[PDB]
Design an enzyme around this catalytic site. Structure first.
Site, PDB file in Angstrom:
ATOM      1  N   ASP B  48       0.879  -1.148   0.000  1.00 31.47           N
ATOM      2  CA  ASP B  48       0.000   0.000   0.000  1.00 31.47           C
ATOM      3  C   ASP B  48       0.917   1.198   0.000  1.00 31.47           C
ATOM      4  OD1 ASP B  48      -1.369   2.311   1.599  1.00 31.47           O
ATOM      5  OD2 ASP B  48      -3.018   0.976   1.080  1.00 31.47           O
ATOM      6  N   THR B  81      -3.525   5.915  -3.335  1.00 28.95           N
ATOM      7  CA  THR B  81      -2.321   6.417  -2.749  1.00 28.95           C
ATOM      8  C   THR B  81      -1.130   6.410  -3.693  1.00 28.95           C
ATOM      9  OG1 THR B  81      -0.994   6.480  -0.773  1.00 28.95           O
ATOM     10  CG2 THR B  81      -1.549   4.124  -1.692  1.00 28.95           C
ATOM     11  N   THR B  82      -0.766   5.240  -4.193  1.00 26.28           N
ATOM     12  CA  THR B  82       0.369   5.106  -5.111  1.00 26.28           C
ATOM     13  C   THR B  82       0.181   5.931  -6.392  1.00 26.28           C
ATOM     14  OG1 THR B  82      -0.649   2.997  -5.824  1.00 26.28           O
ATOM     15  CG2 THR B  82       1.127   2.815  -4.335  1.00 26.28           C
ATOM     16  N   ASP B 377      -8.424   0.387   3.326  1.00 23.01           N
ATOM     17  CA  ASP B 377      -8.609   0.885   1.962  1.00 23.01           C
ATOM     18  C   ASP B 377     -10.027   0.577   1.505  1.00 23.01           C
ATOM     19  OD1 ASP B 377      -5.985   1.915   0.654  1.00 23.01           O
ATOM     20  OD2 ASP B 377      -5.361   0.121   1.753  1.00 23.01           O
TER      21      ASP B 377
HETATM   22  N1  LIG Z   1      -8.576  -5.115 -11.331  1.00 24.41           N
HETATM   23  C1  LIG Z   1      -7.735  -4.294 -11.955  1.00 24.41           C
HETATM   24  N2  LIG Z   1      -7.476  -4.420 -13.268  1.00 24.41           N
HETATM   25  C2  LIG Z   1      -6.905  -3.342 -13.952  1.00 24.41           C
HETATM   26  N3  LIG Z   1      -6.654  -2.180 -13.210  1.00 24.41           N
HETATM   27  C3  LIG Z   1      -6.896  -2.140 -11.892  1.00 24.41           C
HETATM   28  C4  LIG Z   1      -7.385  -3.217 -11.271  1.00 24.41           C
HETATM   29  N4  LIG Z   1      -7.433  -3.019  -9.953  1.00 24.41           N
HETATM   30  C5  LIG Z   1      -6.899  -1.672  -9.667  1.00 24.41           C
HETATM   31  N5  LIG Z   1      -6.779  -1.127 -11.034  1.00 24.41           N
HETATM   32  C6  LIG Z   1      -6.330   0.246 -11.351  1.00 24.41           C
HETATM   33  O1  LIG Z   1      -5.023   0.484 -10.801  1.00 24.41           O
HETATM   34  C7  LIG Z   1      -5.093   1.608  -9.911  1.00 24.41           C
HETATM   35  C8  LIG Z   1      -5.264   1.067  -8.487  1.00 24.41           C
HETATM   36  O2  LIG Z   1      -4.117   0.312  -8.078  1.00 24.41           O
HETATM   37  P1  LIG Z   1      -3.527   0.189  -6.580  1.00 24.41           P
HETATM   38  O3  LIG Z   1      -2.373  -0.735  -6.680  1.00 24.41           O
HETATM   39  O4  LIG Z   1      -4.691  -0.210  -5.770  1.00 24.41           O
HETATM   40  O5  LIG Z   1      -3.005   1.685  -6.288  1.00 24.41           O
HETATM   41  P2  LIG Z   1      -3.650   2.573  -5.102  1.00 24.41           P
HETATM   42  O6  LIG Z   1      -2.767   2.336  -3.940  1.00 24.41           O
HETATM   43  O7  LIG Z   1      -3.639   3.935  -5.673  1.00 24.41           O
HETATM   44  O8  LIG Z   1      -4.988   1.961  -4.967  1.00 24.41           O
HETATM   45  C9  LIG Z   1      -6.287   2.406 -10.410  1.00 24.41           C
HETATM   46  O9  LIG Z   1      -5.928   3.145 -11.587  1.00 24.41           O
HETATM   47  C10 LIG Z   1      -7.263   1.308 -10.792  1.00 24.41           C
HETATM   48  O10 LIG Z   1      -8.056   1.815 -11.875  1.00 24.41           O
HETATM   49  F1  BEF Z   2      -2.959   0.389  -3.138  1.00 28.90           F
HETATM   50 BE1  BEF Z   2      -3.765   1.443  -2.587  1.00 28.90          BE
HETATM   51  F2  BEF Z   2      -3.334   2.133  -1.433  1.00 28.90           F
HETATM   52  F3  BEF Z   2      -5.141   0.959  -2.194  1.00 28.90           F
HETATM   53 MG   LIG Z   3      -6.322   0.825  -3.994  1.00 25.81          MG
END
Ligand SMILES: Nc1ncnc2c1ncn2[C@@H]1O[C@H](COP(=O)(O)OP(=O)(O)O)[C@@H](O)[C@H]1O
Ligand code: BEF
Ligand SMILES: [Mg+2]
Ligand SMILES: Nc1ncnc2c1ncn2[C@@H]1O[C@H](COP(=O)(O)OP(=O)(O)O)[C@@H](O)[C@H]1O
Ligand SMILES: Nc1ncnc2c1ncn2[C@@H]1O[C@H](COP(=O)(O)OP(=O)(O)O)[C@@H](O)[C@H]1O
Ligand code: BEF
Ligand code: BEF
Ligand SMILES: [Mg+2]
Ligand SMILES: [Mg+2]
Lengths: 531, 509, 531
Positions: B48, B81-82, B377
């Protein structure tokens, strides 16, 4: 990329390390696995010799600096902290698991595929267990079966002859506190008093409760045969004004008058009890214990009326004694009824030179025993306790979970094979995800192999035998449990030898090791920043 | 010492760009785990974003500003977040050339970026569709979306459940907006062992504190709860309370009084006929006795946070002085008072067979923290929707839409003011790209196709994670709270705008 | 047990280390394997940039401290020192070999059983090679086949377009020195003059011999078109008395008389040659080279008669020039015949600013060429040579050994499979020794996998394809060579693409890697004693 300082194993180097370490920790604890394990003797920086063969002991007793070696240790401690057994198995399982997985990572397969496989296999493993287990009737009073559970989880850390000495002492204890008719039990009600002198083979089982703090007064009862027992908890010694106070005598003997005035608050509450040992058995057919103190002058009063007075008792003994005798834990002395004392038969204070040892023998409704561990030295007195606990929480688990599992790695050699031929004609998995479940499957063979690796007979060979003597009773149908005989080198029926792995242990060992390993494999960078 | 000129600018940009570089392999469904080592001792095995960047001290000022971005963003929405970090970088980076190469002043590049942000935000709400914050099924398949890309996915469904079953539980509309204080009313409780599924969202609280006296009720059927601040022992005077005695039998007199006041106190409590008395402070042994026969079980020492959550699932309003102890301060609406002994550690429950206590179980004290954060989250994107029932095309779709509508507009603007605007567009594209990369497919290939398909054929078309092919969102769906897409772009463009205001860096207090 | 100081990894720790290291070195050189390898740029402690992709280069160019990493390095250098190719392959083979073996050691099997297996497999591998090879007619003049060998062992270290530039320049060279009709060849007769300026793509092939030391005198021949060539080796400069001597003039000009007396010994032997350039072509249709020196005054004499005089020539050029021209290596000038000079057509001295560059163009009986490597910088001029050598000793090997082997890891994927199904129905092995040959078998798959691992396409997948497209032409009979296509990700016919592994390399790679690994596995203690 980076900023000064802060190191970080990256790419496949980080995974290389993680697996490296795990494999390592694994080998270091493999030795104390199986009844045919190895007794290490480790000494600290002070010279405190201590013997062991319990993974947990050896594990929390060492100073580890490998990050991966911690996440694996902590998850292993978190296991002896719930099932109380199998701390060793889990470190091997996460070790061997990473080795088996690293083989397919090393060939190309993305780790996320080997982790996917793991979860899939995990579920299937936990399903298979519920179909593999052996529902044993809640019917306790089957001391025979339970005595096999005692020895099972005991030979894993005991002097052999001593296994037979402790096998009953543990079971009877668990039973003694367990409340029949399903219900439950709280092991805390099994005091584990331990005393030096005379080897750990001499330890004993008390149906009552043994204590240290004896009657500290000359003219006291050396042995109160047949009597009441008062569960006391109010300060029977001198006290002070909760608000700042001071005396101020203006007269020569006014001093004196004020002298007794202080002690009189004692006798006030102290009388309410002394007449109770009159108001009951005021003619001989008796003993007070009290969590708090009892100053000199007061000990006289009790010694005067032949009332064995104990002071400063282990506070959790309020509840333990309140079962060994029945009498209410009498907090205050005001509303003190003579119909609320407890009862014990022989209650004698064995004095062992400066050491006092009051016993609460002969009870009507025990419900709370005391396993008195004897032992010449401290190192043995240590390990013997760590053996009882790991084998007591072991029997009481056979009860909580009304199921049991054949030992000698029966369940492992089983699940292993199952998964192999399962997906071959299951395809109830995924694409290249077969790798991971294949690994997990092969992985499991840790316990059986390591079990014999310690015994002697060649792992590869003897395990091969089980694989044969097994399907033999499959090509002929019928179910036959098979395990590794760590004495001969052939297979055998775990159930017939009296070899059992507690169910809740296996359920929290697999789900556990996978949790670590499978989360370790998805690791790709070991940071070390933030001074 | 000092660094004026592009010297400054550059190091800032590179710095910021590097910040991204670290967690870029943590954005995506196949995102890896950055096991970090904290100074205090233990470790952090999370992926995360914000939870990583927190555990990394940085030097370069920009790298410090860039790092706190992940925090303010983790404060608005629980998610995204990322993404903000990666975007916040690429923006600065995509400006780098027109910043010096094309010698555009920082004022101008800022004047444009602030402009391109608003337009860009339009395109976000433009593609966003609303949602039934109440439809349990929609909320689940919404919460589920932001549970992927995390160790907690092997129980995805099970998670959104505990998520909704808790968001809604502590919720309390109120209108004269919707207030959901997940923080103070959803105390989590990670317990080592068992299985994941073996975890539930108890509608009450869970304290491990046992009972003040042995022979005391282990579980009152429908208990009458009484919560109080003040301790249960002989109090003292807040002045120079000093007693002088020479009157002999007076020692006994005062020494008695103490017992007497403890009595009174027990009375006032016992009065409203209670069965369960939970105080934040202590409990005199005496008071235990008079509350024993008074007919009630007692619990000493419980945190304010722990207590005030009890007073919402027992109704029992907490009261200080007892001579004022009202009877309205009941203990109604509170199921049992179980006291299960969990592996040599007694607990106490208060479920009812406004504030819940999510109790997680996994396979280590370590593995649990993964869950807790992962869960947070989930439980946060649930709250977001609750307060903004709008969602955005996941799979980086939204991100690409804004890339085009902006790219198009920029190209049709004319003036030096175009280059910085153009960059915001070129920038945005990095998210579907980071995704496609962390997928394994060919970035130049898939993007050109995603971008094209976008240019005309619908905008809810992002990239599929484990696959690596461009898919339409609506199809297999993975919308995310529109709120996330707000912040991610709001502050990222701000960050860039701040650091671009720097032309000089100096050292000394 | 021990004596102070002196450390020693023992038991399975020593083996753990040995394999550890090997596996390591393996991964570090895997990158520069295959045409689709990786170009590393390493700089020393002086800042001498140098590019490479030749395992040997990278290997002897680094400072290694791991004992196991040495025994593996030394055995790998000992390979480029005999077959001149495959230094990279051998490090992988001993690496992967130890991994595959450690798997069965880790399960119990005594190493001596895995080594036994190795030897057994080794023989069977070397038998299989002699049946796998392709006897190619000693018939040279098949420049077509040889140009495929040039490109084969070149793309392994060349700028692609430059492969096509050097592919001929190498083959023609090997041929030019090789003596048809079986016989033999000594590559030393292929001067490899290298000069800076103009990229390494501009390098050229000289059918003659190019040199540095030009005619160092103003009025010298800028270009001797069509002439004799004198192979000289006697000191054409001032000399001294081999026994202590000194002059002692008593007369004013006696000095002078003694002045010329010293130089006169020169002209004595110097005349015997100057009249030779008269006694032959004393009327124009010429050049002396000399291994030793030629002082000023003498250079005049030669420059006077228009005799291009070179001095201090590479002594091995005596033999090289004695083929480029034919003329005997004239040691002394006494018995000097005019019928023993050599002959060259255009012999011109291209002056490149302070740098002299005399060529010996147009020859009748070459038998000794010169590959002139051009190149802007030193780093490139370095690597380009290290590419030519590794690809020249490569063609000349196709000749020595009148056999060749299909590349793309054909031979490996073959032997691998063979051994698998071989012992299954061979039993021409031993008891539990099957393990070792099984490993060795699986081991071999290094090259094919690593070959694609570098290209990109998934090793596991593409190798699977070859395993299929292979038996396809087996279940249909007929022999079809199969290899890994490092461009697509499918299989292909090595022979058809023009991909060949020199026979002597494969024969000294397998017998080599096994020699190390198999001797490493039998190691059980790493001493470090004897200050
Ligand atoms: N199931 C998935 N398939 C393709 N893209 C995804 C999927 N799950 C998350 N995403 C995309 O990737 C990003 C979320 O990734 P994540 O690793 O959760 O980062 P964050 O910490 O910002 O949530 C968003 O742009 C979301 O649209
Ligand atoms: F990966 Be994120 F912070 F949900
Ligand atoms: Mg996320
Ligand atoms: N005599 C036996 N023969 C075969 N297996 C046994 C025997 N006694 C107990 N075992 C095995 O001991 C294993 C556990 O090892 P132990 O040393 O108890 O470590 P832990 O219990 O801490 O994992 C169990 O898997 C059980 O099958
Ligand atoms: N284009 C190709 N396709 C498949 N294999 C090839 C190709 N060209 C050469 N190879 C392989 O290159 C391998 C040797 O790798 P190289 O980098 O030359 O290291 P070394 O020759 O030092 O071992 C040979 O096994 C050969 O099969
Ligand atoms: F050795 Be274990 F903890 F039974
Ligand atoms: F890279 Be090798 F030496 F051909
Ligand atoms: Mg055990
Ligand atoms: Mg080669």
């Amino acid at each position: 990329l980076l900023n000064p300082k802060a190191e970080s194993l990256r790419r496949d180097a980080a995974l290389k390390v993680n697996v490296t370490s795990a494999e390592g920790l694994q080998s270091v604890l493999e030795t104390n696995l199986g009844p045919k394990g190895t007794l290490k003797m480790l000494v600290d920086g002070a010279g405190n010799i201590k013997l062991t063969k319990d993974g947990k002991v050896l594990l929390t007793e060492m100073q580890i600096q490998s990050p991966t070696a911690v996440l694996i240790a902590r998850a292993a401690a978190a296991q002896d902290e719930i099932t109380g057994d199998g701390t060793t198995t889990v470190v091997c399982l996460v070790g061997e698991l990473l080795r088996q997985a690293h083989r397919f990572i090393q060939e190309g397969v993305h780790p996320r595929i080997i982790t996917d496989g793991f979860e899939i296999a995990r579920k299937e493993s936990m399903k298979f267990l519920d179909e593999f287990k052996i529902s044993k009737t809640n019917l306790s009073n089957d001391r025979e079966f339970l005595l096999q559970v005692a020895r099972s989880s005991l030979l894993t850390k005991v002097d052999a002859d001593l296994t037979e000495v402790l096998t009953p002492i543990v079971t009877d204890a668990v039973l003694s506190v367990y409340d029949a008719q399903a219900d439950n039990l709280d092991l805390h009600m099994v005091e584990i008093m331990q005393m030096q002198h005379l080897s750990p083979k001499d330890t004993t089982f008390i149906k009552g409760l043994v204590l240290d703090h004896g009657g500290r007064h000359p003219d006291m009862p050396t042995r109160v045969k047949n009597a009441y027992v008062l569960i006391l908890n109010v300060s029977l010694e001198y006290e002070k004004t909760e608000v700042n106070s001071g005396f101020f005598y203006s007269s020569a003997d006014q001093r004196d008058k004020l002298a007794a005035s202080e002690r009189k608050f004692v006798d006030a509450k102290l009388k309410k009890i002394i007449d109770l040992k009159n108001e009951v058995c005021g003619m001989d057919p008796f003993v007070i214990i009290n969590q708090k103190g009892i100053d000199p002058m007061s000990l006289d009063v009790f010694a005067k009326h032949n009332i064995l007075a104990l002071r400063r008792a282990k506070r959790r003994n309020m509840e333990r004694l309140q079962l060994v005798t029945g009498g209410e834990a009498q907090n205050s002395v005001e509303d003190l009824s003579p119909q609320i004392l407890g009862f014990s038969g022989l209650v004698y204070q064995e004095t062992i030179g400066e050491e006092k040892f009051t016993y609460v023998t002969e009870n009507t409704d025990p419900k709370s025993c005391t396993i008195l561990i004897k032992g010449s030295t401290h190192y043995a007195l240590a390990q013997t306790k760590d053996a009882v606990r790991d084998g007591l929480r072991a029997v009481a688990n056979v009860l909580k979970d009304k199921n049991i599992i054949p030992g000698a790695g029966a369940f492992y050699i089983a699940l292993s094979r199952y998964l192999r031929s399962a997906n071959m004609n299951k395809l109830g998995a995924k694409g290249k995800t077969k790798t991971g479940i294949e690994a997990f499957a092969e992985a499991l063979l840790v316990i059986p192999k390591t079990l014999v690796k310690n015994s002697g007979f060649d792992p590869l060979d003897v395990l091969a035998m089980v694989e044969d003597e097994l399907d033999d009773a499959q090509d002929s149908d019928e179910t036959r449990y098979v395990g590794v005989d760590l004495n001969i080198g052939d297979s055998c029926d775990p159930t017939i030898e009296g070899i059992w792995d507690s169910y809740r242990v296996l359920r929290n060992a697999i789900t556990g090791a996978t949790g670590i390993a499978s989360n370790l494999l998805l690791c790709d960078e070991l940071l070390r920043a933030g001074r | 010492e000092r660094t004026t000129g592009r010297q400054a600018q550059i190091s800032n940009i590179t710095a910021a760009k590097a910040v991204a570089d670290v967690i870029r392999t943590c954005l995506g469904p196949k995102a890896m785990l950055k096991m970090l080592l904290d100074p205090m001792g233990g470790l952090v095995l999370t992926n995360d974003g914000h939870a990583i960047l927190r555990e990394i001290d940085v030097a370069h000022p920009a790298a410090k500003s860039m790092l706190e971005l992940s925090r303010t963003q983790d404060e608005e929405v629980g998610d995204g977040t990322t993404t903000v970090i990666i975007l916040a970088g690429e923006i600065l980076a995509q400006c780098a050339p027109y910043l010096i190469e094309k010698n555009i002043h920082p004022v101008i590049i800022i004047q444009a970026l602030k402009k391109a942000l608003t337009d860009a935000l339009e395109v976000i709400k433009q593609v966003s569709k609303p949602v039934d914050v109440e439809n349990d099924a929609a909320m689940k398949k919404l919460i589920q979306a932001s549970i992927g890309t995390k160790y907690v996915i092997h129980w995805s469904e099970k998670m959104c459940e505990l998520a909704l079953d808790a968001v809604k539980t502590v919720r309390k509309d109120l209108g004269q907006n919707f207030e959901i204080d997940i923080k103070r009313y959803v105390r989590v409780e990670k317990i080592p062992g068992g299985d994941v599924l073996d975890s539930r969202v108890l509608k009450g609280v869970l304290l491990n504190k046992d009972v003040v006296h042995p022979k005391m009720s282990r579980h009152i059927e429908n208990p009458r709860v009484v919560l109080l601040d003040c301790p249960l022992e002989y109090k003292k005077g807040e002045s120079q309370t000093n007693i002088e005695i020479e009157k002999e039998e007076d020692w006994n007199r005062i020494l008695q009084i103490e017992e007497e006041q403890v009595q009174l106190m027990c009375e006032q409590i016992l009065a409203v006929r209670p069965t369960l008395v939970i105080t934040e402070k202590g409990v005199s042994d005496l008071a235990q006795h008079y509350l024993l026969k008074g007919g009630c079980s007692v619990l000493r020492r419980v945190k304010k946070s722990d207590n005030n959550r009890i007073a919402r699932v027992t109704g029992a309003t907490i009261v200080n002085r007892v001579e004022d102890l009202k009877e309205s301060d009941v203990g109604t609406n509170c199921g049992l008072f179980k006291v299960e002994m969990i592996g040599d550690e007694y607990f106490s429950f208060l479920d009812n067979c406004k504030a819940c206590t999510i109790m997680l179980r996994g396979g280590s004290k370590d593995i649990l923290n993964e869950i807790d954060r992962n869960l947070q989250d989930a439980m946060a994107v649930a709250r977001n929707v609750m307060l903004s029932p709008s969602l955005s095309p996941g799979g980086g779709a939204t991100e690409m839409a804004v890339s085009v509508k902006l790219a198009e507009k920029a190209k049709q603007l004319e003036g030096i003011q175009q280059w910085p605007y153009q960059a915001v567009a070129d920038a945005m594209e990095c998210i579907p790209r980071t995704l496609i990369q962390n997928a394994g497919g060919d970035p130049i290939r898939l993007l050109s196709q995603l971008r094209a398909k976008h240019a005309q054929g619908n905008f809810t078309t992002g990239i599929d994670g484990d696959k690596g092919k461009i898919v339409d969102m609506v199809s297999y769906g993975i919308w995310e709270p529109e709120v996330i897409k707000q912040q991610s772009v709001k502050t990222a463009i701000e960050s860039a705008c701040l650091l671009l205001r720097v032309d000089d860096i100096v050292s000394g207090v």
